[PDB]
Design a protein around this ligand. Sequence first.
Ligand SMILES: COc1cc2c(cc1OC)CN(CCc1ccc(NC(=O)c3cccc4c(=O)c5cccc(OC)c5[nH]c34)cc1)CC2
Ligand SMILES: COc1cc2c(cc1OC)CN(CCc1ccc(NC(=O)c3cccc4c(=O)c5cccc(OC)c5[nH]c34)cc1)CC2
Ligand SMILES: COc1cc2c(cc1OC)CN(CCc1ccc(NC(=O)c3cccc4c(=O)c5cccc(OC)c5[nH]c34)cc1)CC2
Ligand SMILES: CC(C)CCC[C@@H](C)[C@H]1CC[C@H]2[C@@H]3CC=C4C[C@@H](O)CC[C@]4(C)[C@H]3CC[C@]12C
Ligand SMILES: CC(C)CCC[C@@H](C)[C@H]1CC[C@H]2[C@@H]3CC=C4C[C@@H](O)CC[C@]4(C)[C@H]3CC[C@]12C
Ligand SMILES: CC(C)CCC[C@@H](C)[C@H]1CC[C@H]2[C@@H]3CC=C4C[C@@H](O)CC[C@]4(C)[C@H]3CC[C@]12C
Ligand SMILES: CC(C)CCC[C@@H](C)[C@H]1CC[C@H]2[C@@H]3CC=C4C[C@@H](O)CC[C@]4(C)[C@H]3CC[C@]12C
Ligand SMILES: CC(C)CCC[C@@H](C)[C@H]1CC[C@H]2[C@@H]3CC=C4C[C@@H](O)CC[C@]4(C)[C@H]3CC[C@]12C
Ligand SMILES: CC(C)CCC[C@@H](C)[C@H]1CC[C@H]2[C@@H]3CC=C4C[C@@H](O)CC[C@]4(C)[C@H]3CC[C@]12C
Ligand SMILES: CC(C)CCC[C@@H](C)[C@H]1CC[C@H]2[C@@H]3CC=C4C[C@@H](O)CC[C@]4(C)[C@H]3CC[C@]12C
Ligand SMILES: CC(C)CCC[C@@H](C)[C@H]1CC[C@H]2[C@@H]3CC=C4C[C@@H](O)CC[C@]4(C)[C@H]3CC[C@]12C
Ligand SMILES: CC(C)CCC[C@@H](C)[C@H]1CC[C@H]2[C@@H]3CC=C4C[C@@H](O)CC[C@]4(C)[C@H]3CC[C@]12C
Ligand SMILES: CC(C)CCC[C@@H](C)[C@H]1CC[C@H]2[C@@H]3CC=C4C[C@@H](O)CC[C@]4(C)[C@H]3CC[C@]12C
Ligand SMILES: CC(C)CCC[C@@H](C)[C@H]1CC[C@H]2[C@@H]3CC=C4C[C@@H](O)CC[C@]4(C)[C@H]3CC[C@]12C
Ligand SMILES: CC(C)CCC[C@@H](C)[C@H]1CC[C@H]2[C@@H]3CC=C4C[C@@H](O)CC[C@]4(C)[C@H]3CC[C@]12C
Lengths: 646, 182, 213
Amino acid sequence: PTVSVFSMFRYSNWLDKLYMVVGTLAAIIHGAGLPLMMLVFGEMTDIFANAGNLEDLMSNFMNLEEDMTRYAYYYSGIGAGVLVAAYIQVSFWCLAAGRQIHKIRKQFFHAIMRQEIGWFHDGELNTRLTDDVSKINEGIGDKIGMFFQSMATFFTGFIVGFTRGWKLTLVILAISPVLGLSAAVWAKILSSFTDKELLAYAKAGAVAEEVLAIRTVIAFGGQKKELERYNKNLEEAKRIGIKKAITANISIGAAFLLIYASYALAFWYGTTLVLSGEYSIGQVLTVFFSVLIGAFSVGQASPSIEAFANARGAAYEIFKIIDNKPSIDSWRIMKLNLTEWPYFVVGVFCAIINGGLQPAFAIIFSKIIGVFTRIDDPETKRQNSNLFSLLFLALGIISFITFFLQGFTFGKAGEILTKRLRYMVFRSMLRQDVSWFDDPKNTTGALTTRLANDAAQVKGAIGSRLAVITQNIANLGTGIIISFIYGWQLTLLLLAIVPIIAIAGVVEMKMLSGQEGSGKIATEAIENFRTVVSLTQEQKFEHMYAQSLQVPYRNSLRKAHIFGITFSFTQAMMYFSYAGCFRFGAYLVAHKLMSFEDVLLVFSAVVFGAMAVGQVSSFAPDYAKAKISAAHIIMIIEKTPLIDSY
Amino acid sequence: QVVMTQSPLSLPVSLGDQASISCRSSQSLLHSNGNTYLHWYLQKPGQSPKLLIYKVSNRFSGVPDRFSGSGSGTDFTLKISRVEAEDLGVYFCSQSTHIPPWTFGGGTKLDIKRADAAPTVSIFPPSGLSVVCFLNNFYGVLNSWTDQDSKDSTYSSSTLTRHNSYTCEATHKTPIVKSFNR
Amino acid sequence: EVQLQESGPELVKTGASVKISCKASGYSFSNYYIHWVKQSHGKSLEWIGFISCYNGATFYNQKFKGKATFTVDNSSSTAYMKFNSLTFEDSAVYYCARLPIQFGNFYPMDYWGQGTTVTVSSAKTTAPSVYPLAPVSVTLGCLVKGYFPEPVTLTWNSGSLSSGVHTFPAVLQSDLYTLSSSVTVTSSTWPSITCNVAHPASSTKVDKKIEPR
Ligand SMILES: COc1cc2c(cc1OC)CN(CCc1ccc(NC(=O)c3cccc4c(=O)c5cccc(OC)c5[nH]c34)cc1)CC2
Ligand SMILES: COc1cc2c(cc1OC)CN(CCc1ccc(NC(=O)c3cccc4c(=O)c5cccc(OC)c5[nH]c34)cc1)CC2
Ligand SMILES: COc1cc2c(cc1OC)CN(CCc1ccc(NC(=O)c3cccc4c(=O)c5cccc(OC)c5[nH]c34)cc1)CC2
Ligand SMILES: CC(C)CCC[C@@H](C)[C@H]1CC[C@H]2[C@@H]3CC=C4C[C@@H](O)CC[C@]4(C)[C@H]3CC[C@]12C
Ligand SMILES: CC(C)CCC[C@@H](C)[C@H]1CC[C@H]2[C@@H]3CC=C4C[C@@H](O)CC[C@]4(C)[C@H]3CC[C@]12C
Ligand SMILES: CC(C)CCC[C@@H](C)[C@H]1CC[C@H]2[C@@H]3CC=C4C[C@@H](O)CC[C@]4(C)[C@H]3CC[C@]12C
Ligand SMILES: CC(C)CCC[C@@H](C)[C@H]1CC[C@H]2[C@@H]3CC=C4C[C@@H](O)CC[C@]4(C)[C@H]3CC[C@]12C
Ligand SMILES: CC(C)CCC[C@@H](C)[C@H]1CC[C@H]2[C@@H]3CC=C4C[C@@H](O)CC[C@]4(C)[C@H]3CC[C@]12C
Ligand SMILES: CC(C)CCC[C@@H](C)[C@H]1CC[C@H]2[C@@H]3CC=C4C[C@@H](O)CC[C@]4(C)[C@H]3CC[C@]12C
Ligand SMILES: CC(C)CCC[C@@H](C)[C@H]1CC[C@H]2[C@@H]3CC=C4C[C@@H](O)CC[C@]4(C)[C@H]3CC[C@]12C
Ligand SMILES: CC(C)CCC[C@@H](C)[C@H]1CC[C@H]2[C@@H]3CC=C4C[C@@H](O)CC[C@]4(C)[C@H]3CC[C@]12C
Ligand SMILES: CC(C)CCC[C@@H](C)[C@H]1CC[C@H]2[C@@H]3CC=C4C[C@@H](O)CC[C@]4(C)[C@H]3CC[C@]12C
Ligand SMILES: CC(C)CCC[C@@H](C)[C@H]1CC[C@H]2[C@@H]3CC=C4C[C@@H](O)CC[C@]4(C)[C@H]3CC[C@]12C
Ligand SMILES: CC(C)CCC[C@@H](C)[C@H]1CC[C@H]2[C@@H]3CC=C4C[C@@H](O)CC[C@]4(C)[C@H]3CC[C@]12C
Ligand SMILES: CC(C)CCC[C@@H](C)[C@H]1CC[C@H]2[C@@H]3CC=C4C[C@@H](O)CC[C@]4(C)[C@H]3CC[C@]12C
């Protein structure tokens, strides 16, 4: 039961329609920016490789800087265009969604107060008002821009690949389906991770809220019975969580292995074509990166369709309600997990190995490209390219294994800790007294949210923090050390933008993820609707609601522009990094202080190392909130009652 | 600046037989990477030189197993097992180890071996002074030489442009002298 | 099917300039150097230099630096070699070869051009002088002297006497070419024949009958 496609934008005026049109135009322009950048990257790589080959030939760089000024200009132009287009897209789609959602909220409350007493259906109506409109917002908001941007990226990358090298383009097309499928599964797992963590506990949460809602339990003395009833559903939730920690991690590890195996295959075939003289290494780079990023994006834009369908489903009931025409017309924390040190040891080892996978990839990639920036025997070049393709495949296998192992070990330790903490907290609460239960800071809702959230958040201050820190160290620290060994001037230059690249990764992950007052008036009106319709305060309550929506409306309209500008700037910084790094690299290669191999190594190990650091740190939970919840859990566990009933 | 010396400037061969062309370099052609970059090309009159062998012994794609390459250091050899009619030409070697100056061999033309012969030397007084000498069919001076004829595979003139005694010595490797008075 | 097609033979004047071409087909043009080689008559091949078909970077042999210029047109995928202030010692056959950029000097010159003949001479067009030659089997022959330029299509009896003929190649004799021809016929046919020389460049046709001395 969904509304029509062109019926969900019924509350969009001419300004919202213009916003949506210009937003999808800017989204297409923004999506068509990465394949163009890969084209420019391939041309620049060809320049560097030809200069290096000629220098190695005439042994016994005079135009390199002049040629690289032009490509720095191209990089900067694409970066400024991406800045403008991404800002326009994000801001315009956010504005259109916000205005339509404001109108929908107002109309929905107006119609809710307009219903009849026989109509007034439950709780249910309140949850509808606070959740279905958020569903519509998520569906008609930035996700449409995401879908159009990724469609543009896919089509532009494949067009660039087919116009640059159709043989390699077809070879990577043959694996594009599994790449898009893995990207879609990855995005779905990331989008439905917290909802499944709630679904796993939804069974035990009912037993908790029923027992805590408690004097009967204390009187009849069934504390042990209710404790075992809770512990059974806790076992079930722990089993479901362990199954998820297995499945999600093995799927994402398979995705990583597929990415690296695509690297291996595509580079093996591309080196074959280059050694045969048909392709150049820059052409291979352009084709490979364009087609691969397009195939990944076309699968990355799969949750947008699900969000749109959920928006249609959620808007169906709201539109039916608002179209109803009634008859009448009115150390201390880590010790908690100390028994899981066998899991933590394996987790830390696998996190070290997983973090070290990015510098290893930088080394292998730089070496396989530097094979073609120098002259050598054909057989030697072929053997080196084969060895580096096999090394790419080994990187993929190690990535799969260690990613799955780290994820599973840390998730199992977290599930064990969560079950244990929930059990001890429920036991200590059942051991407490009615004098403790009467304390209005110990409300039933507060206790249930302590059991549901705080116990599940303590693991964020131990396993999650440890894994994130270990991975980010083993990645970026080793990358920076190797970059200082190989090219210290380029490393010193790129260290100035390392924080901005990490912040760009964080902001982009938050952007893909999608991360009071008016609710009070609404719930009071819905609860006391009999008295409201008796005193005929429908219009006055509508007025109070509309005035309580004003500050959130203005905050949303401002946050639209703020997040648009910050996202656009963080995106354009990734484009400007190319220009800066490779201009300085052209200088250093022309002045014989470094080679293009080392330039590529420093680039891949520093810029993309920081990007991966940001992408990983986007998954780290709030450490302060985790420690506060751990303190809460610990005090409730160690609380001893006065009138002991145990 | 390696000077490549091809040992036989001309090599008379016969159909269905083995031919060997030698190449000597003034310097060791072995590279630091353990490879020797000596290549053998065949050049036919009016056509592009065709690559036969590269890196001493490796046969180029399409070259029949008739051609083989051997040797090392400063001594290399190209061998043709059964000289066919499509093998007559100029075989020249080329080194690629020591560059910038790519250097090539002098070349080796494959003549067709037949029985020995003697020229039919004749003279002609002028008919401007110019005495000509026609030395046909053999196996101010100006000389010309015809190529190996396709029928009998034999070579065939001199021109000089006073004294009455005007002779012409034909000191062939098999002398003959013809005289004439005005 | 890799092909390097070169321009036709060109006869130029001394001190002038001329540009020969090498058009590539059947492969990726921008992935190779085009090397130029010079072959004089009775001499081994000599490397002039190379050009990069990707950007146009040149390298010249120190002997030819200044008197030769390499250029490339990537649109038509052709290479050009231009001379400057030509001289007699420049008359030779010039070949173009391709070399993979990835393996410089670690890989042979796999494909060559068919060659461009460049004849440098300051002399102008001249009329061939035909001179019979008879003795004092019978051997006869008419010699062509002092003609320019190539060629002259000498023939015996307008083709009806094609057996026993030996037309030696023309040789330069002080800026003018000289050619000879021989014919050996049984003692019964002579003095009981006529040689025809045709110089198309000067549009001359001379028929001469051999007479006994
Ligand atoms: C919203 O979903 C999830 C949320 C959380 C977790 C897993 C989820 O989904 C599976 C793990 N928790 C426990 C802490 C924790 C341990 C280890 C990691 N290290 C990883 O490498 C990782 C692990 C899971 C997923 C991903 C990615 O998707 C991912 C995407 C792009 C790039 C990446 O790195 C370069 C990525 N790296 C990871 C992260 C975090 C925290 C919260
Ligand atoms: C070594 O070479 C390479 C290596 C790699 C790549 C390319 C390479 O070479 C070109 C590409 N990387 C690519 C990583 C990679 C994968 C997938 C994504 N999607 C999302 O985050 C995502 C998409 C859609 C919807 C959502 C959500 O609703 C959502 C909701 C909550 C939380 C989330 O998350 C924290 C969410 N997230 C998403 C991003 C990044 C992998 C490594
Ligand atoms: C202007 O540049 C960029 C702009 C943007 C992104 C990436 C850019 O740069 C490639 C990410 N987009 C979002 C989709 C997206 C996500 C992640 C990726 N992961 C990788 O590509 C990647 C991952 C890990 C290691 C490496 C390397 O060691 C590496 C070395 C050399 C060259 C590379 O790539 C040309 C490399 N790549 C990577 C790509 C695409 C938003 C904007
Ligand atoms: C890069 C280029 C193409 C972007 C062009 C965007 C243009 C068409 C947009 C951007 C912001 C828009 C304005 C935003 C707000 C208002 C106020 C409203 O009461 C009248 C329309 C008006 C004044 C809009 C007119 C159109 C507008 C100026
Ligand atoms: C919203 C807009 C940007 C979408 C249109 C994308 C345009 C700008 C893209 C898509 C395909 C691209 C072309 C793909 C391949 C080539 C061949 C290359 O040798 C020169 C650039 C050129 C000719 C590209 C120019 C830019 C291009 C035409
Ligand atoms: C968002 C975009 C459109 C902003 C403007 C970017 C412009 C300046 C960029 C984008 C793509 C670029 C082209 C990409 C590739 C090539 C091929 C190369 O052999 C010559 C330069 C050329 C032709 C570039 C010229 C500059 C270019 C057109
Ligand atoms: C249907 C699934 C299994 C494959 C889909 C992609 C197919 C159609 C693609 C992928 C790889 C492609 C091949 C890649 C390379 C070559 C060599 C070329 O000289 C002729 C075409 C040929 C032989 C291609 C034919 C089409 C091809 C087989
Ligand atoms: C099963 C799915 C996921 C992947 C399928 C990949 C297939 C289509 C790939 C993997 C290996 C590829 C082959 C690798 C090498 C060559 C040799 C080349 O001269 C022609 C193309 C050819 C023959 C490729 C054709 C396409 C190929 C068979
Ligand atoms: C892209 C996904 C779907 C499949 C990738 C796996 C296949 C196609 C790839 C991955 C690694 C590749 C191998 C890497 C190295 C070598 C050694 C070389 O001496 C021969 C080819 C060979 C043996 C490659 C064959 C193709 C290969 C096995
Ligand atoms: C895990 C953290 C702490 C350290 C990571 C170190 C990694 C990046 C280093 C350590 C040793 C390195 C290897 C050492 C030697 C070789 C052989 C060479 O022909 C290809 C690269 C390769 C295979 C290196 C790849 C990168 C490598 C594996
Ligand atoms: C060359 C050597 C010295 C480089 C060392 C880099 C170190 C200091 C960097 C690399 C990765 C970084 C971490 C990355 C992510 C996070 C999570 C965030 O919520 C708090 C900071 C924290 C924990 C960072 C602390 C500093 C850190 C550990
Ligand atoms: C993280 C940052 C702040 C660390 C400090 C270094 C920063 C400021 C960068 C910015 C500009 C850089 C300089 C730019 C150019 C040169 C000239 C070169 O021949 C040696 C390195 C040197 C001298 C660089 C040293 C590092 C440098 C000073
Ligand atoms: C010079 C060396 C140490 C590198 C510089 C340190 C960089 C990589 C560190 C220092 C502070 C770090 C940030 C600290 C806090 C956060 C907030 C978190 O929600 C996402 C990660 C993010 C945004 C971190 C990204 C990485 C970061 C910027
Ligand atoms: C203010 C926001 C939008 C951008 C901030 C960074 C800007 C100012 C930086 C990032 C990278 C920089 C470019 C890096 C390299 C070069 C090449 C040089 O030969 C001329 C300047 C030029 C082209 C720089 C211009 C300024 C630039 C574009
Ligand atoms: C501000 C940083 C973080 C990002 C942008 C860096 C830009 C502005 C830097 C990076 C490399 C730099 C170039 C490195 C070397 C030279 C050669 C010198 O003879 C003139 C300046 C010039 C041409 C620099 C200009 C500025 C430059 C392009």
